[PDB]
Amino acid sequence: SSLSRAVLDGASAAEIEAAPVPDTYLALHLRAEDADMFKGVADKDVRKSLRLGEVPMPELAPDEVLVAVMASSINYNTVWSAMFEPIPTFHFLKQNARQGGWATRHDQPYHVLGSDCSGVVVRTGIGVRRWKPGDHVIVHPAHVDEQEPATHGDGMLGTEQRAWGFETNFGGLAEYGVVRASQLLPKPAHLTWEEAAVSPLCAGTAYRMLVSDRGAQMKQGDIVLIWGASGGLGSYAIQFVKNGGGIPVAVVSSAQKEAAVRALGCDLVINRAELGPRRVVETGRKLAKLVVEKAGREPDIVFEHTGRVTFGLSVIVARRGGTVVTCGSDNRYLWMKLKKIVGSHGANHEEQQATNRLFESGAVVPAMSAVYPLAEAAEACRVVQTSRQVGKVAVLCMAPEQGLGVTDPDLRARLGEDRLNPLRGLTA
Amino acid sequence: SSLSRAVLDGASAAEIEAAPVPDTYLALHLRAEDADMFKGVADKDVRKSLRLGEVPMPELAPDEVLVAVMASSINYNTVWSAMFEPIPTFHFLKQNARQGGWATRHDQPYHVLGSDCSGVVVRTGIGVRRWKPGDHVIVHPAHVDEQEPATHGDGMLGTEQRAWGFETNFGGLAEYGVVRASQLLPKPAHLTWEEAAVSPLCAGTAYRMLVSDRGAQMKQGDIVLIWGASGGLGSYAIQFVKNGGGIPVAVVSSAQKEAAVRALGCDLVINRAELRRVVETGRKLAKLVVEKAGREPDIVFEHTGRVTFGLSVIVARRGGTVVTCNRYLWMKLKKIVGSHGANHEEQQATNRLFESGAVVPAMSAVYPLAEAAEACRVVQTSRQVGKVAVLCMAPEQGLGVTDPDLRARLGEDRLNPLRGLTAT
Amino acid sequence: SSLSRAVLDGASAAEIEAAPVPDTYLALHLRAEDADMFKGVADKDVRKSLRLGEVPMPELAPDEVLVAVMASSINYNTVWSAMFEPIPTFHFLKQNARQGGWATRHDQPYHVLGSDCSGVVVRTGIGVRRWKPGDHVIVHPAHVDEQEPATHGDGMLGTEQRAWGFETNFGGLAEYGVVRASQLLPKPAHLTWEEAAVSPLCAGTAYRMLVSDRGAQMKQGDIVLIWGASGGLGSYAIQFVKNGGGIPVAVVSSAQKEAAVRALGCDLVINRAELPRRVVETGRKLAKLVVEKAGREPDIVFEHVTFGLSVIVARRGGTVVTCGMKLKKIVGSHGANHEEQQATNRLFESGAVVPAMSAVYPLAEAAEACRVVQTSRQVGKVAVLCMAPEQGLGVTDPDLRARLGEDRLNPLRGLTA
Amino acid sequence: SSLSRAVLDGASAAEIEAAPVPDTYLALHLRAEDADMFKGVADKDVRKSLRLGEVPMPELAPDEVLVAVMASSINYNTVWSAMFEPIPTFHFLKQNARQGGWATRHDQPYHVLGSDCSGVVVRTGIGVRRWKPGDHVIVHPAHVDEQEPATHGDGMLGTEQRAWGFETNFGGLAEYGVVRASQLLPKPAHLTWEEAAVSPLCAGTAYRMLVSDRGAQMKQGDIVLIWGASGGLGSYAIQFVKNGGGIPVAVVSSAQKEAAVRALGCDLVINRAELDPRRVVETGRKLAKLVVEKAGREPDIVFEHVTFGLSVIVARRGGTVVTCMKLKKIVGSHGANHEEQQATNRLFESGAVVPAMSAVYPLAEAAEACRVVQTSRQVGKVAVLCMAPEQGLGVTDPDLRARLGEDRLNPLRGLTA
């Protein structure tokens, strides 16, 4: 449209405001009618359920912003949606909508996915403060109710707290996204669109788990065991740990995954191939011995995110008074050794600003390893579904090519293209 | 008006949104042209500056609520405003307005005062969730920007956090108030308008200071020394300390103030009349706390900012906390927490304690809006105990009880321990 | 001994100091050679393994205190010890002794049990400050190494932290106990010997779990779900929740257990009988009932089989404290450090909290006391008389006791499960 | 003596144990008779009060350790003591002794000073665990009562907590020191005696104030304003801030002091020089503007040790002032507990933080070193050799020392103010 052409030309705010908002737009989405299609199936191929096509543009609520999405990224919640697992997302959309008012727009026969993105503001509701058409933004997933009392103690704790594009519609894997003003932050000027896009969900989550006072809250000198360290979450967890003056010990399962974590500066590396009932107890003793060997003590904090076997082990190997922080699901390993387990996901608007400030300074860098065009977004989802990636897989949306969107080139030069892209061209 | 009549009659939501909003309303307020009137004056008599008259009704922003105010209260920020101290509130209003957009409405030649209240919702902006016309509400004063990151970590810490009716316009000492929806909580059903109205600010403030994890965070068994315990803050502080299993020790400056403090179940009472001089007075105070309570205080609760603040620092136990709004600091490893107000989360927690009757209102007097200036003066001259309420649109006392069975179970006497009490 | 008589007649400091220390003392104990006696045995009857007899008086270490034990209590760890489950305690004693030095003494062919007690100091080591013979004390179980850096941030967190009479020898189910000076607090004067001895382990455990900043850290207004509320841990938990202005909700499995919990001031009560993939559904019905009774989902779930249920029912951002896409916390805890035990002791001293004592046996009958706990026939706490010849002794503040009331102090007298 | 000869030549544990303890030792000390000597004197030259001479060797308490001191350092409390200001330390030594028992030894007509040190264990009390003659230690100043409940929640918070060599006798500025075993940590092997000795007091202090959960507790990204950045505290403050991913902003008052701070990796620097309580508000205004220009926002933590009022003003809403308007926290702190000291020691052991040593004096010239600190001529820390006859000794892991490099470990060598 004239609007996308104006955004891509980087036109003035008055030009953007003058260009008309189109009636529909191109979006990676699911269809309600397909919710049951994988009923019998062992391998729920994500490419079978995913559609790319025109969906209707919704009316903007007063506290919402319409964002022309330049790039987005694949997340695991995207893979789960497309699998319809473990409950199809249309159930979440109906729940959302039972609130009434503006929330009823979320209940549609279609669901636009995508929980991250970078882009350009094109419209704001009349209750939106500061943001204007033309502004470069990042969007993080915490879609919350600022009227709820719990939100004012912790953005993540509200009963209405939702993940954008997973439990809400109008997500990022599209030409346009609809978001609350409290999901928006200024784009780090020195990054490309795709670079900026891959961070908010994964880096924010890791930040909450590790740095923030609402998580493990590490300190310099802590030893941190990081499971699945070469993936999206582990890639930022390694970086926050080094930056904080901690000592990361990564667990990987392959030569290539080992190479990825070394690229992020994790030199203490354990290969899962030594080992991974009574065998869980034993394996834990093996693991604990290796951490002491490599780092000097048992870990102070264990970081885990599969929710599989690694969770039980985490509890075993954490030091007495240690903390396990987790995402995804012998009593004496808990109470006898006085340990703590912190269940965490996402991050509130304050934490995401803190995470952003760390990218704005270059203290932390994006974990982008691959870029797919929006026309190939289904295959990028499959690649994440089959664990063929290290770090993050970005998707160009409205951006017609890679390398666009840098508005502080001098800074980018100072920091270094390669420093900024440690995982470029790497896979699993 | 037909709107006020509809509200006062207990009409349906339909009836309320059918009744037109008036273009002016009656409000206790200050005039910009008067900000210099106490230049040179010793007694800055609030009755000289405070005006009661009609003021233009503003347009409602998307996230705002027009509240028909039933009852309000006098707070010390109200007194300070009327004194144009320490800076005229008009400087805060112009700073507010520099944000632009909807904030420009706050910069007027008039300032409608009032920082808490109870009332009935009459209009809501198109971005307001859940609230509807006819809903019984309380308003607390945390007027904050929900778009700011810091707000989602602690409502009080945003750059744009303001005290309603002090750093914003359209406060509660008026027939109507304009509030952000994140200032609203359901009214406790068993309370009258005036009872409900006296708490949010002072009780909220003490909650954050004493109970919340953002303040001193008392535990059962803590000894808490409470300066100026008979006033608005201390009345609620005594309640939170007892409710949580703590041991309150009150400081008062008269027999009638002692009576008020005893009325709230504080039985350990110290009179000021018992007293480099500061260092000596401090050791005297610490001796008395050990006599009465068994150890030095764990937390000291301070709020005049006068001599009590140096003393607090002295008498707090090693590793202790002074909450307020040289070797005694670092050698004894003490903590000072500066605080005021309360965020929307703390205010809800405070509301739930009033809702179950675990704590009760500290209302001691009630004035009609026609006499609100004299009520302000009573507070300025410290002739009150607890809280002074102001009836706004409520035409008499005792209205607004919508849970009479609960009220009767708690005891109307139990709900009003400070009834009829004064400081003189 | 002339020592036991002097203590009982309430003699002087000098008189206790003049009376010699016998070379053996009477003690409830296990034998290392018995460790295998229950092999292939389903009911591990503790009456079969518990011995009552003479054991020799060990040498006193510099930082230790010899306590003439007036009363003790039964705790879960005594039962487990007497079953030799899951590992015999003789393995623990041996691990202790490996330190060398003074720890060597713990490695014995016998094991004197007992983790709480009350009594009278009779000897102090040359490195012990303040305490002198004649002093009335309670003893709590935290036997810690004050040389470890960890101990100086949190007494429970040292690698050498051990439970007295479980992982150490010379426990409190005997006429005397040897403790480290940092296990000692003054006895609440208004209480009898048996009343004071029931609390330290269980009330300190609950204090850390609920009150302390090292646990879930309740505030007034919190809804706290308490599993197994009529037992020893649960009896103090209810009391701390109520005293801190919280709202307790108790789960019980019988009508007499509901009786014990209501005696302690818990008016919101849930029977375990009101009620794979069925864990989630059972979660939903438990959560519905808590909202029905208390008004909201619980802020804290106090757990000690039901761990997974506790995780389901806690609110978003809630806490599950346990002793054996959500935002929940789980805190594993046992014991209490010396600081938390002193804070606990002060709540008993003011009468804000009362002992959970329900029954009393002489030391002659402690194996039966141990069986009662083993078979879950108690509510609250079972006391054992050690050197005290009768109940009712050791009150040294009569006017406070009359004021608080013997009744109020004994809400669980004679009750059973 | 033959003991000191054995220590210096590297004799075995049993050889140390066998060489007798001398009756007197050489110590830097104050005399009680001199306590009025500066009446009406403005410049209380510490070189007039300080004596170096033989003093009697005390009896060793069961929980104590005798240390042959290889090196020590000057601290502000040493200066203050030698000035008898504001109160003669002899008044602390009497208050201490008032506890009785083993504390009586502290009340003497002399007072040996020195609050940190490194050296070699020579004797242990019968209650001391693990340590052996021959072991290389550092000593930190937290002299604490391990029996008091508070110690077990936080080592610094007990009523009996004292500064070694300042509120206790038998300090580090002598050939021997007497310490509690709870003051000892293993010596970082790659360091010299003198390098290891300068850190424990100041580095532990800054650790508590900034890294620990008992102080300001910085996170990566925090902007920290550091007043008087070039001194002993500020030198370690800068290091911890950088190592924790924080952004330090140093305030210095001369170009030489600016040189010291940049040698420690602080790139953001403000000169004091740049300019009623309305004047402190105005000075606050310009300060805050300078921090925003250099760092990007107002400071999250102000590290303060005249400037207190300014620190309160410049802190952000919700910010912290840590010290040794409407929503701010002020944390008073000094020292570090035994746990914080070990965490501090661990960052030295890895090379993450380096000693802040700027100069070395022999014990013979220690009064001169004290005058240097009294007159603020120093940057960082001044070390004193005690039993070590020369510099460069005491490294026992020279491979790590080579990896890290002598210059990296000594960024402030040869510098002054």
Automatic annotation (TrEMBL), chain B:
Domain Enoyl reductase (ER) intervals: 45-390
Binding site for NADP(+) 2: W80, T205, G232, L233, S253, K257, R272, H340, S382, Q384
Residues reported in the UniProt entry to bind NADP(+) 1: W80, T205, G232, L233, S253, K257, R272, W330, H340, Q384
Keyword Nucleotide-binding appears in the UniProt entry: yes
GO molecular-function term, one example from the UniProt record: crotonyl-CoA reductase activity
Keyword hit for NAD: no
Location within or outside the cell: Cytoplasm
Keywords: Acetylation, Cytoplasm, NADP, Nucleotide-binding, RNA-binding
Classification via Pfam families: ADH_N, ADH_zinc_N
Gene Ontology cellular component list: cytoplasm
Gene3D superfamilies, per database record: Medium-chain alcohol dehydrogenases, catalytic domain
Domain of life: Bacteria
Main location per the UniProt record: cytoplasm
SUBUNIT field: Homotetramer.
Protein name, entry field: Octenoyl-CoA reductase/carboxylase
Organism of derivation: Streptomyces cinnabarigriseus
Name of the encoding gene: cinF
